[PDB]
């Protein structure tokens, strides 16, 4: 989706995460590696605002 679309349709603008976390099976002795989709990570604009559910939100620092 694009930024304009997201705000218009109230969807969060975010990026997908695909990791192929495959090392080895339990007892089959055969590596079964599959690119699993863990979730979505929000993206920040160049100005610093992230659009979540159609609402521009900011993150304030802390001391």
């Amino acid at each position: 989706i694009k930024e304009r679309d997201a705000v218009y349709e109230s969807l969060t603008y975010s990026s997908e995460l695909y990791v192929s976390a495959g090392l080895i099976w339990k007892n089959s002795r055969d590596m079964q590696e599959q690119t699993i989709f863990i979730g979505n990570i929000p993206l920040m604009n160049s100005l610093g605002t992230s659009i979540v559910n159609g609402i521009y939100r900011i993150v304030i620092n802390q001391i």
């Binding site: 192929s20 599959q34 690119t35």
Partner: peptide
């Protein structure tokens, strides 16, 4: 899509 998913489906 055309690379990782293709290599996973083919191999």
């Amino acid at each position: 899509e055309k690379i990782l998913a293709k290599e996973k489906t083919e191999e």
